[PDB]
Paper text:
Sandercyanin (SFP) is a BV-binding lipocalin protein found in the skin mucus of the Canadian walleye, Stizostedion vitreum (formerly Sander vitreus). BV associates non-covalently to each SFP monomer in a ZZZssa conformation and is stabilized by aromatic stacking, hydrophobic interactions, and water-mediated H-bonding inside the lipocalin-like beta-barrel fold of SFP. The binding of BV induces tetramerization of SFP via interaction between amino acid residues from adjacent monomeric subunits. Using a combination of designed site-directed mutations, X-ray crystallography, UV/VIS, and resonance Raman spectroscopy, we have identified multiple conformations of BV that are stabilized in the binding pocket of SFP.
Author numbering: 20 to 185
């Protein structure tokens, strides 16, 4: 279903966010169950764009062994708030992409809440520069998540095993 009652929180974001340090490959460690991501081995690649934002290439492996991917764009509508991006894909309405925390080199926590009148749709990933992330880092980030109405108990652990994902 993925539609949940109540409207979105406005969590705090990475205040000093440098999109240039955020570029390259990020691996999905944990994610909320959502509509689009039906697979495993989920990676996001962020690329140089002429403009203010960056180009997005998201990639996953489905249960039948097929690779499915999407291209989009992430751009901060307010350069006072550079961690509040909007994600543009296809014909779609932009969805928020909020970097709540990153050290650029190890981890990020990303959130997107879509308001649907009285209900909402939430995306939340813990990502890593590696296919794994220390259980301490995941605990801290899960801690941030619980503080704005995400249930850590809903989080999928993403399969990043080279034997399936190669
Ligand atoms: C928390 C933020 C977050 C947002 C804003 C989000 C949105 C989002 N992810 C999508 C696809 C996707 N999203 C991902 C992966 C990712 N997406 C990411 O933002 C990140 C960090 C990864 C993983 C590292 C994948 C693999 C797809 C393709 C799904 C498919 O087509 O099978 C789509 C397009 C749907 C489509 O056309 O199929 C949207 C709008 N998902 C998220 O996780």
């Amino acid at each position: 279903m993925f539609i949940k009652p109540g409207r979105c929180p406005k969590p705090a974001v990475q205040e000093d966010f440098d999109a240039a340090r955020y570029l390259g490959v990020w691996y999905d460690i944990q994610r909320l169950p959502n509509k689009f991501q039906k697979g495993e081995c989920a990676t996001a690649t962020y690329s140089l764009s002429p403009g203010e934002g960056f180009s997005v290439f998201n990639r996953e492996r489905l249960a039948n062994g097929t690779i499915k991917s999407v291209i989009g764009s992430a751009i901060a509508e307010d350069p006072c708030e550079p961690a509040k991006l909007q994600f543009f894909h296809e014909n779609a309405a932009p969805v928020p992409y909020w970097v709540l925390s990153t050290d650029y080199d190890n981890y990020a926590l990303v959130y997107s809440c879509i308001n649907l009148g009285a209900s909402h749709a939430a995306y939340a990933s813990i990502v890593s520069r590696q296919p794994t992330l220390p259980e301490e880092t995941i605990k801290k980030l899960q801690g941030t998540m619980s503080s704005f109405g995400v249930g850590v108990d809903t989080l999928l652990t993403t399969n990043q095993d080279a034997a399936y994902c190669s």
